[model samples]
Target: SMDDDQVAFSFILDNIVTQKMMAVPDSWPFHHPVNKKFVPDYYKVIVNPMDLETIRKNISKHKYQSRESFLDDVNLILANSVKYNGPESQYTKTAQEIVNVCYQTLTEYDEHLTQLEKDICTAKEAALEEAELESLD
Candidate 1:
């Protein structure tokens, strides 16, 4: 049984990845893994290859335990794009744009979660104080 937070986090992660994929333009080449047959030097230059499809599959498999893990994979895709395609390449620009969107989305959700937890704690304390006051009456 997944806890409330786990379920919420999973949903957030799914949406983030889906939005990233959607943000990628049709001309983007990094949506799928690089074909070694076409770019043999790609693997030689980039040790760790990453793609949006791989990240999506990892999320479905529950491979990412935390938000950091998810971010790492997404960043890896960006890093690989910049390294192989060069900073001036359209692919690199697209990767940067997609990663930025993910970062912004994560920040917004994290802030919301933090506030939600704080509210929960404050509510619990108030309920406890009320119960104590009632007992004295």
Candidate 2:
């Protein structure tokens, strides 16, 4: 059995929303994430250096084991319980969630990428056509 301290589901975040500021866009991508509800790409609400630095500082506080420590334990237990049996057999339950989060992030990225690709392609095609028309003299 895993100890309560061994596993925890606390915020794991000093300020996830604020930390995102460190992850702010250095340059605009083909298409920025937009919320059509109000306007497209009009929201400037995803940056908080203080929050980001806090997380980053804490993250770097530990050594190499910092990141791996948490995931390693998770993987260890999951490997032991792949089946329906006990520790010896394959254990399951928590895996579904971890897998789902991975799946969702990837799926969302693909979907967003596809849309951005379409936007870029459309922009390029328009530019090429305009150039061709101008050069038709």
Candidate 3:
């Protein structure tokens, strides 16, 4: 008998193969909301033939071990998407785009985080300096 994880994996694998190499659009019973967000990465790996081939060449052989094995493929897909989608020097551009797509979806919070970090550190140093001067008096 399959455990819950195995059962779920079987279902997803079944649909992934049958439904155009991915889950059916507008149904999405397989992936959660966050997982759904990364579907484009999967598309970039599988839908683009050259990128997919390059990725397949790098994958280690597996005997269909477990659900975790299938889940780990997501990392490989994302890595390959980042790897082959652009030139080596464009990583910074791609990185910011990734931040924009993932964390900065609606707003530029990732950019704001850097500014906030700088502001907080300046305030912290000022407070420490004031404390040291008071202690010396």
Candidate 4:
């Protein structure tokens, strides 16, 4: 009944809330905190879809992308935590299995990012070779 709603609310607050207001600084379960801080790059990526598109468009623009760009993108995704902030993203009293499932799904998508990084490195290497060839010419 009404208790289910309360239970759901508690579940979310305990398991998914990432902000410091909910995730206190001192007490945390994971090796790291819930990422309870604002991130400018995260905002730029998640808040602006176009910026993400630009990153995609530019990944191989240089052979791949600069190593800095790779780091920035990874940090952005990691800092943003998760779109839905499922349970494993935090610690909660319920749905550990479902949360684990969500994290698995997240990792599946994270693999795409790994591929993107690879593409960026390949592109960068190609550009470096082309630059060397030009120097010889």
Q: Per-residue alpha-carbon lDDT of model 1 for 11-86, expressed as tens digits?
A: 6788887875547575257677889999989899999999887887786765665667788998998888888889
Worst 10 residues of 2 by lDDT: 1-10
TM-score of 1: 0.71
Candidate 1 displacement at residue 42 in angstroms: 1.5
> Candidate 4: minimum summed lDDT over ten consecutive residues — where?
13-22
| lDDT tens per residue, model 3, 55-119 | 22222222223333433443343454355454353532443333233322213333433444445
Candidate 4 C-alpha lDDT tens digits along 1-137: 22333333223222322332123332233223233264435334445221222333343243223334433542343334443344355523222332343344435445544545455456657878999999999
RMSD of each: 8.5, 21.7, 17.8, 17.0
- Point out where model 2 deviates above 4 Å: 1-105
- Residue 108 of candidate 1: its Cα lDDT? 77
| Tens-place lDDT digits, model 2, residues 1-137 | 11121121112321221233223343121112234485443334322111223333443442112223323433433343343224342223443333234234435445543444455456657878999999997
* All candidates in order of TM-score, best leading: 1, 4, 3, 2
Give me the candidate number with maximum TM-score: 1
Off by over 4 Å in 3: 1-11, 16-62, 87-137
Two-way lDDT contest, 2 vs 4, winner? 4
**Pairs of residues at least 3 apart in sequence or in different chains that clash in candidate 3:** none
What lDDT score goes with residue 73 in model 1? Answer: 92
